[PDB]
Amino acid sequence: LQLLRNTRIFVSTVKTGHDTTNTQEILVQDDISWGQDSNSTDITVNEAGPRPTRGSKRFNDSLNAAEWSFSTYILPYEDTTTGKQIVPDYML
Amino acid sequence: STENRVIDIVVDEKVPYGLIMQFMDVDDSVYPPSEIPVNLTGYSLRGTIKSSLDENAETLASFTTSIIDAAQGAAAISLSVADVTNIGEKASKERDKYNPRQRFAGYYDILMTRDVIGSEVSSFRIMEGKVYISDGVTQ
Amino acid sequence: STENRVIDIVVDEKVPYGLIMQFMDVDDSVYPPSEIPVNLTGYSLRGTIKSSLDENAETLASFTTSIIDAAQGAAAISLSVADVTNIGEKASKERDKYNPRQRFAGYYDILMTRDVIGSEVSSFRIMEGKVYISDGVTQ
Amino acid sequence: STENRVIDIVVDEKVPYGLIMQFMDVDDSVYPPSEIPVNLTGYSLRGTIKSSLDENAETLASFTTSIIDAAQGAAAISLSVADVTNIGEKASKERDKYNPRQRFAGYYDILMTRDVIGSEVSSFRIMEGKVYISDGVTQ
Amino acid sequence: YYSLMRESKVIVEYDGRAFHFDALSNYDVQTSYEEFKTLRRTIHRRTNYADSVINAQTPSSISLAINFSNTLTEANFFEWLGFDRKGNTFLLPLYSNNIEPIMFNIYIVNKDNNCVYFENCYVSTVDFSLDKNIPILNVGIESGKFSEVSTYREAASIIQGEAMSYSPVIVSTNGNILPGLISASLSFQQQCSWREDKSVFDINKIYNNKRAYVNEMNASATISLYYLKRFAGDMVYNIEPETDVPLNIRNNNISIDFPLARISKRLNFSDVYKVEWDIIPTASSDPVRIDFFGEI
Amino acid sequence: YYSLMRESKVIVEYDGRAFHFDALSNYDVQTSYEEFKTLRRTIHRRTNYADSVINAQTPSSISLAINFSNTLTEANFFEWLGFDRKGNTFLLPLYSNNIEPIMFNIYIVNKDNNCVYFENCYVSTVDFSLDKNIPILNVGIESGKFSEVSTYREAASIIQGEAMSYSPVIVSTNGNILPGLISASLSFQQQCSWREDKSVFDINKIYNNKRAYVNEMNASATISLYYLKRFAGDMVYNIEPETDVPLNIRNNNISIDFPLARISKRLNFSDVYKVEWDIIPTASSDPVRIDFFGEI
Amino acid sequence: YYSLMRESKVIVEYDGRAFHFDALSNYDVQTSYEEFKTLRRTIHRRTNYADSVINAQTPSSISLAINFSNTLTEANFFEWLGFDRKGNTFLLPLYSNNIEPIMFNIYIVNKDNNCVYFENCYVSTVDFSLDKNIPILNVGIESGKFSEVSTYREAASIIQGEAMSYSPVIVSTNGNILPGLISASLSFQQQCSWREDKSVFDINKIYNNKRAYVNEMNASATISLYYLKRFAGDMVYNIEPETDVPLNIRNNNISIDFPLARISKRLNFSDVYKVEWDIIPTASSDPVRIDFFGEI
Amino acid sequence: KIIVQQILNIDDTTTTASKYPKYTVVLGNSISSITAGELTAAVE
């Protein structure tokens, strides 16, 4: 079973040919959240009279856009190969 | 347009049933149309009702058929009271609130052929649809 | 106009019942449409009442039937008082909110035949519906 | 009408380039406005391409320029294939989302002069814009 | 002393009797005067101040919304509208001997003698629907004259009783019930015109309308249904306009019958397909019938 | 550089002076050109492309909403509308020697020289109410010509000052105060027409309107009250239209007087009974008066 | 069995082929019959029951909203509207050899054979905008005849594919891009009239319209911009109407070109100053061009 | 360039395809063209 604490996050500029430059692991605090959600449309006949029809139908219509959030400590450091300062999430 | 091949029929139970069909050429040359009866000499009609569209569905009846007039271009098909009574026990048990007598019975299909072959083609599907039975309380 | 075959009936308890009907053929090729009395020679009527559409449902009554004025298209059908008593005994207790004097009792049909041509007969379900009993305090 | 001095250019790789232009003076004092070919005697053209507006930006090419039909106001400007190769080598890799065959390459200007009267000269910036290279798979 | 609609009262006076419509749900009214006005520009003097005079009371419209009441007193509205009456039955006469509509008289009453009186009036419309709600009857009236007054005729036995309980509508033809109802709406009318009477004899007097003549009557209805078919090839419930249909509409307590009617149809491809029937009597039709029944 | 209404400015120029209405609350404006267009269908060639030309600037409407200002500068609107002036007093002249309305000139100013100029204009309406809210004065103007321009005439001493404090309305007749006020609303007008001047001499030139003539002036008002009576049989507060009533309307800081007026009445049976008076001067009435007073 | 728009289907039939516009976003339709009616008042008998007859089907309007689809099938709407076609290019012919518009035929299909068929139709309008939203194409159609029917022609390969991805609009002139766009809106039309054909031969028959003739075509557009100037004294972006402007409008996937156009301008002093351009081709202009490009 | 086509019936033998339906079949449950009065007179 998927345990949330085992979660790891990688971001990339690309779908393929991932490398140490186009792709970056990031730290998180354990307050991460993510997901996607469904919009569903329900219809029923409004009827008069003594012996009305009664049922209903519904249809899945569309999805909302996916949403994500996470939080991170600010952590400036010196890039060991260049002597420049960076933070791990500069790509963001 | 399309041929309007799809037609559905209702049979009144405990009473004989018959349908007549006439084949005509038509020329639209003048306002009263130049319709002409087709010669039906040496043609035959077949048709059956089955409970569902399947390889081994139950068969309820075969139509009685004949040509009444080869030159008026008229064929007829019919069902006896014995056939339609055999229908009325095997059609389904649902009834509509506003229309309690009407019950679904099955699917039907009318097929015509030349009695002596043209060989390149030999038959065609005239018409098709489904059959409902109307319950009745007299004999 | 609407092809209505359907009419409900209201008999009344302790009282014999009778209905008269008049047949007219109406032609709308010319205006206003022309209404003509049907010569009712050689036709005959039947009909029955039973408590449900079911194939086992028991008969409650059958109509007396007679032609009245063949040249005028008049016929009549009727039920004796004893038949009415049987209806009233068998019928529901349930009342009707639009008229609490009426109680449901069964289904009916007045199947009619013609035997005029060639000594050969045919039959069709000219009129159909439900039948109710109205209660009466006068005995 | 709009005083548009500005037009962008699309050269094509591996292929020499050339543009012809026709000069007309249009007078709208009388209707419809009268269009007249400019006598192009004694005028001369220049122009250059370089990779940015910057004062240090390096030159990529300069136009061959010639008058064609002085009485008709015709002149032409052109670039040799080698110049086109230099453009294609220096130009950006970045593509354009409206036409992925086009790549940005620099800025250009075709400054023009007249030396007709009194042996004294004047010059003005008749046309200006960007220049792109279109890629070609045929070599 | 102010006044308040929430404790206003309406009394109708006719035939030397008076009707207290206690169960009023709403009403709306205006009153106004007509004026003649001219500015008389003139090159001697480009006058800027207008010359004007008030002449006449405008014919007020009146509008009422009334709930159906056990003891049925509101049937008198149909009686005044010009139906003939047979106990609780009302009939349209196929042709009518009236010329003037039935004139009647109205008090509006409030506390502190703060009363208003409308002297000549006639009914122009009665209109209601059975649309899945407590059936509310609208009335349109006109009145030709008004005044304020300190007093009103008492009325106490002819009071509109308690409201009748709800019940669902049915529509039928020859005892066939009609599937999938959505609504029924009815209107009845007595179109009239006032005869303009103003004369040079009326100069420097205020003028009123005094008599009107009946132009027309109408009875008409609308029905809304869901689109339904019994089997695909059926013909009975097609779009095409039927004619000479006998048609009957009722609640538990009210019944309306058209012995023969002409039906227009309109279809709307809303999310569920809807059909509207427009109903009218045919020229040969017999008297349309209306009945009322009191709940126990 | 964009532009913003929230920092736009309006300057009025007249008589070789300029008025800075600093205390503007709102304004609305449009500009447009008229065009002639024909499609010239022809059995030789059923042309599909229209032939058309632009000819003239449309006469722009202008609309302004202005708060009342201590230092009273907005009185010049009445002066331009064509009241005669006596210090702070304004009067309608009973008849007028004008034919053309008073022409004047407008700058709209913004940052970055982004300015607009309206060359010939006239006031068509001034209109306001004392309806239990900070009294806001509307103005309707027309202008016959516009253009964009890089600069404007400075104006700095003729600036509309601080807003006057709130105070409640009073209505009175001969010093009788009137019970149960709800609102008072006023309008004043200078109806005019442009003289159409376009000529075949103007062909292939853009054309403008240049002169207009005064058709009419109006002064009129409405009052809304609750319906009240002193005692049931009273006559003074009846519905019937009075005439030759002297009428005076004021706030703390503004006063209007009709020396003689004609009153129409309308009554509305809303939840509390309401009355509207429609007011107009009589032909013999003396000059209506307006006064302004500055708060300390 | 009811019916539902959420599972309705539309099929267009033409040239003995059929087009399945799968990607429908919305549609709206009505149907009705015309009736003749007279009340025949008569001093012998002031009849109250009207005499009336139904004669003809009304010409239905149809309205559709369609998303742009990869595989471009909707280009056939322009083909039917009467553009000439050159692969994916469409052109207005400067003059046209048509008299009748291109007739075509429509099925509306649903479950349970519950189908409807519209027999003679023509396109009257195509209309869309690039206003910062997924571009939705409206169509206005008329049809002269309808009926209900049990069946429809299958269509399965000519199906409108997947929707094209979003992209932002550009406007340009001679490759100058135009600063500060807000919107572009386009419309194209084929104004037509039905020829009224009803005759005394049609008495006691239901009548339909059968033929129409083309009155006009139009192509026109609107653009909304923020007001901007390069430097205060500039002339290129003034208000004054330019003429003979070449104008090009595109997305990633759609391109429209007016080789020469006439521009009206209107300016609005909203909170940020806004300008509207009204666009029309000049009589001498060459064929306006339209192109489509599929996304990869 | 253009191609037109139709189904091949069993009765039509063979002929050039055409831009219209040719045959029509008409259905009913009964004949209205003959009266019982005629048919009886004919037998009688």
PDB file of N, CA, C and O in Angstrom, chain G residues 178-211:
ATOM      1  N   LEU G 178      -0.190  44.668 -34.426  1.00  0.00           N
ATOM      2  CA  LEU G 178      -0.974  45.750 -33.869  1.00  0.00           C
ATOM      3  C   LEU G 178      -1.017  45.672 -32.351  1.00  0.00           C
ATOM      4  O   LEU G 178      -1.404  44.633 -31.804  1.00  0.00           O
ATOM      5  N   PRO G 179      -0.638  46.730 -31.642  1.00  0.00           N
ATOM      6  CA  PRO G 179      -0.488  46.641 -30.188  1.00  0.00           C
ATOM      7  C   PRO G 179      -1.820  46.692 -29.462  1.00  0.00           C
ATOM      8  O   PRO G 179      -2.733  47.427 -29.845  1.00  0.00           O
ATOM      9  N   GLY G 180      -1.922  45.907 -28.395  1.00  0.00           N
ATOM     10  CA  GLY G 180      -3.018  46.047 -27.459  1.00  0.00           C
ATOM     11  C   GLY G 180      -4.356  45.554 -27.954  1.00  0.00           C
ATOM     12  O   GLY G 180      -5.349  46.285 -27.907  1.00  0.00           O
ATOM     13  N   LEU G 181      -4.399  44.318 -28.432  1.00  0.00           N
ATOM     14  CA  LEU G 181      -5.658  43.739 -28.861  1.00  0.00           C
ATOM     15  C   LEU G 181      -6.546  43.407 -27.678  1.00  0.00           C
ATOM     16  O   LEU G 181      -6.081  43.139 -26.568  1.00  0.00           O
ATOM     17  N   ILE G 182      -7.849  43.423 -27.937  1.00  0.00           N
ATOM     18  CA  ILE G 182      -8.845  42.971 -26.987  1.00  0.00           C
ATOM     19  C   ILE G 182      -9.732  41.895 -27.586  1.00  0.00           C
ATOM     20  O   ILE G 182     -10.010  40.882 -26.936  1.00  0.00           O
ATOM     21  N   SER G 183     -10.194  42.091 -28.815  1.00  0.00           N
ATOM     22  CA  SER G 183     -10.976  41.035 -29.443  1.00  0.00           C
ATOM     23  C   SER G 183     -11.050  41.242 -30.944  1.00  0.00           C
ATOM     24  O   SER G 183     -10.869  42.353 -31.450  1.00  0.00           O
ATOM     25  N   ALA G 184     -11.394  40.157 -31.635  1.00  0.00           N
ATOM     26  CA  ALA G 184     -11.843  40.178 -33.017  1.00  0.00           C
ATOM     27  C   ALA G 184     -13.085  39.324 -33.211  1.00  0.00           C
ATOM     28  O   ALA G 184     -13.175  38.211 -32.684  1.00  0.00           O
ATOM     29  N   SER G 185     -14.045  39.860 -33.952  1.00  0.00           N
ATOM     30  CA  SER G 185     -15.307  39.188 -34.210  1.00  0.00           C
ATOM     31  C   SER G 185     -15.636  39.278 -35.692  1.00  0.00           C
ATOM     32  O   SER G 185     -15.462  40.331 -36.307  1.00  0.00           O
ATOM     33  N   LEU G 186     -16.099  38.173 -36.266  1.00  0.00           N
ATOM     34  CA  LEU G 186     -16.330  38.063 -37.694  1.00  0.00           C
ATOM     35  C   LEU G 186     -17.749  37.584 -37.938  1.00  0.00           C
ATOM     36  O   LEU G 186     -18.287  36.766 -37.176  1.00  0.00           O
ATOM     37  N   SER G 187     -18.319  38.031 -39.058  1.00  0.00           N
ATOM     38  CA  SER G 187     -19.549  37.445 -39.554  1.00  0.00           C
ATOM     39  C   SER G 187     -19.586  37.437 -41.073  1.00  0.00           C
ATOM     40  O   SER G 187     -19.033  38.317 -41.743  1.00  0.00           O
ATOM     41  N   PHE G 188     -20.243  36.411 -41.596  1.00  0.00           N
ATOM     42  CA  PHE G 188     -20.444  36.190 -43.013  1.00  0.00           C
ATOM     43  C   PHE G 188     -21.894  35.790 -43.210  1.00  0.00           C
ATOM     44  O   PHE G 188     -22.459  35.061 -42.386  1.00  0.00           O
ATOM     45  N   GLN G 189     -22.486  36.232 -44.312  1.00  0.00           N
ATOM     46  CA  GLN G 189     -23.923  36.105 -44.474  1.00  0.00           C
ATOM     47  C   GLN G 189     -24.274  35.721 -45.898  1.00  0.00           C
ATOM     48  O   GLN G 189     -23.502  35.930 -46.835  1.00  0.00           O
ATOM     49  N   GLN G 190     -25.466  35.145 -46.040  1.00  0.00           N
ATOM     50  CA  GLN G 190     -26.076  34.895 -47.335  1.00  0.00           C
ATOM     51  C   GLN G 190     -27.561  35.226 -47.217  1.00  0.00           C
ATOM     52  O   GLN G 190     -28.404  34.352 -47.034  1.00  0.00           O
ATOM     53  N   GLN G 191     -27.867  36.513 -47.276  1.00  0.00           N
ATOM     54  CA  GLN G 191     -29.240  36.972 -47.160  1.00  0.00           C
ATOM     55  C   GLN G 191     -30.062  36.472 -48.337  1.00  0.00           C
ATOM     56  O   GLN G 191     -29.657  36.620 -49.494  1.00  0.00           O
ATOM     57  N   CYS G 192     -31.227  35.900 -48.035  1.00  0.00           N
ATOM     58  CA  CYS G 192     -32.091  35.279 -49.027  1.00  0.00           C
ATOM     59  C   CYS G 192     -33.546  35.576 -48.702  1.00  0.00           C
ATOM     60  O   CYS G 192     -33.890  35.938 -47.576  1.00  0.00           O
ATOM     61  N   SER G 193     -34.401  35.412 -49.709  1.00  0.00           N
ATOM     62  CA  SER G 193     -35.843  35.446 -49.515  1.00  0.00           C
ATOM     63  C   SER G 193     -36.471  34.202 -50.117  1.00  0.00           C
ATOM     64  O   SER G 193     -36.111  33.791 -51.221  1.00  0.00           O
ATOM     65  N   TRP G 194     -37.437  33.631 -49.409  1.00  0.00           N
ATOM     66  CA  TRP G 194     -38.308  32.632 -50.007  1.00  0.00           C
ATOM     67  C   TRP G 194     -39.252  33.257 -51.025  1.00  0.00           C
ATOM     68  O   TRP G 194     -39.838  34.313 -50.780  1.00  0.00           O
ATOM     69  N   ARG G 195     -39.405  32.598 -52.171  1.00  0.00           N
ATOM     70  CA  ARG G 195     -40.462  32.952 -53.110  1.00  0.00           C
ATOM     71  C   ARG G 195     -41.789  32.363 -52.648  1.00  0.00           C
ATOM     72  O   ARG G 195     -41.954  31.140 -52.616  1.00  0.00           O
ATOM     73  N   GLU G 196     -42.729  33.229 -52.297  1.00  0.00           N
ATOM     74  CA  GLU G 196     -44.082  32.797 -51.972  1.00  0.00           C
ATOM     75  C   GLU G 196     -44.796  32.202 -53.178  1.00  0.00           C
ATOM     76  O   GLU G 196     -44.921  32.853 -54.219  1.00  0.00           O
ATOM     77  N   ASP G 197     -45.263  30.965 -53.034  1.00  0.00           N
ATOM     78  CA  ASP G 197     -45.752  30.168 -54.146  1.00  0.00           C
ATOM     79  C   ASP G 197     -47.211  29.780 -53.996  1.00  0.00           C
ATOM     80  O   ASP G 197     -47.800  29.257 -54.949  1.00  0.00           O
ATOM     81  N   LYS G 198     -47.805  30.028 -52.837  1.00  0.00           N
ATOM     82  CA  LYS G 198     -49.151  29.565 -52.540  1.00  0.00           C
ATOM     83  C   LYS G 198     -50.178  30.050 -53.549  1.00  0.00           C
ATOM     84  O   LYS G 198     -50.170  31.209 -53.968  1.00  0.00           O
ATOM     85  N   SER G 199     -51.063  29.139 -53.945  1.00  0.00           N
ATOM     86  CA  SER G 199     -51.995  29.362 -55.034  1.00  0.00           C
ATOM     87  C   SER G 199     -53.336  28.762 -54.654  1.00  0.00           C
ATOM     88  O   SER G 199     -53.427  27.880 -53.797  1.00  0.00           O
ATOM     89  N   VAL G 200     -54.384  29.237 -55.325  1.00  0.00           N
ATOM     90  CA  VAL G 200     -55.703  28.641 -55.212  1.00  0.00           C
ATOM     91  C   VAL G 200     -55.736  27.187 -55.630  1.00  0.00           C
ATOM     92  O   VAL G 200     -56.706  26.486 -55.331  1.00  0.00           O
ATOM     93  N   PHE G 201     -54.705  26.710 -56.316  1.00  0.00           N
ATOM     94  CA  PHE G 201     -54.580  25.281 -56.537  1.00  0.00           C
ATOM     95  C   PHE G 201     -54.277  24.535 -55.250  1.00  0.00           C
ATOM     96  O   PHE G 201     -54.580  23.342 -55.151  1.00  0.00           O
ATOM     97  N   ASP G 202     -53.694  25.210 -54.267  1.00  0.00           N
ATOM     98  CA  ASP G 202     -53.284  24.586 -53.020  1.00  0.00           C
ATOM     99  C   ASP G 202     -54.415  24.485 -52.009  1.00  0.00           C
ATOM    100  O   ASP G 202     -54.209  23.936 -50.922  1.00  0.00           O
ATOM    101  N   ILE G 203     -55.597  25.006 -52.339  1.00  0.00           N
ATOM    102  CA  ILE G 203     -56.706  25.007 -51.398  1.00  0.00           C
ATOM    103  C   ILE G 203     -57.004  23.608 -50.888  1.00  0.00           C
ATOM    104  O   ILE G 203     -57.035  22.632 -51.646  1.00  0.00           O
ATOM    105  N   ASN G 204     -57.225  23.521 -49.580  1.00  0.00           N
ATOM    106  CA  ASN G 204     -57.424  22.272 -48.856  1.00  0.00           C
ATOM    107  C   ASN G 204     -56.212  21.356 -48.907  1.00  0.00           C
ATOM    108  O   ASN G 204     -56.327  20.159 -48.633  1.00  0.00           O
ATOM    109  N   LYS G 205     -55.049  21.885 -49.259  1.00  0.00           N
ATOM    110  CA  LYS G 205     -53.796  21.185 -49.055  1.00  0.00           C
ATOM    111  C   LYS G 205     -52.910  22.006 -48.138  1.00  0.00           C
ATOM    112  O   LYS G 205     -52.979  23.237 -48.116  1.00  0.00           O
ATOM    113  N   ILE G 206     -52.077  21.310 -47.373  1.00  0.00           N
ATOM    114  CA  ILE G 206     -51.014  21.973 -46.639  1.00  0.00           C
ATOM    115  C   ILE G 206     -49.925  22.428 -47.594  1.00  0.00           C
ATOM    116  O   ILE G 206     -49.569  21.721 -48.545  1.00  0.00           O
ATOM    117  N   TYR G 207     -49.387  23.614 -47.341  1.00  0.00           N
ATOM    118  CA  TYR G 207     -48.445  24.255 -48.241  1.00  0.00           C
ATOM    119  C   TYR G 207     -47.101  24.442 -47.561  1.00  0.00           C
ATOM    120  O   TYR G 207     -47.016  24.582 -46.339  1.00  0.00           O
ATOM    121  N   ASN G 208     -46.054  24.442 -48.373  1.00  0.00           N
ATOM    122  CA  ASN G 208     -44.692  24.623 -47.909  1.00  0.00           C
ATOM    123  C   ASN G 208     -43.996  25.621 -48.814  1.00  0.00           C
ATOM    124  O   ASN G 208     -44.398  25.829 -49.960  1.00  0.00           O
ATOM    125  N   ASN G 209     -42.951  26.244 -48.294  1.00  0.00           N
ATOM    126  CA  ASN G 209     -42.027  26.932 -49.171  1.00  0.00           C
ATOM    127  C   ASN G 209     -41.129  25.919 -49.860  1.00  0.00           C
ATOM    128  O   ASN G 209     -40.843  24.846 -49.325  1.00  0.00           O
ATOM    129  N   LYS G 210     -40.698  26.261 -51.065  1.00  0.00           N
ATOM    130  CA  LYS G 210     -39.991  25.318 -51.912  1.00  0.00           C
ATOM    131  C   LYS G 210     -38.762  25.895 -52.584  1.00  0.00           C
ATOM    132  O   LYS G 210     -37.863  25.125 -52.937  1.00  0.00           O
ATOM    133  N   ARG G 211     -38.691  27.206 -52.775  1.00  0.00           N
ATOM    134  CA  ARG G 211     -37.563  27.824 -53.443  1.00  0.00           C
ATOM    135  C   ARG G 211     -37.338  29.213 -52.877  1.00  0.00           C
ATOM    136  O   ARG G 211     -38.282  29.908 -52.493  1.00  0.00           O
TER     137      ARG G 211
END
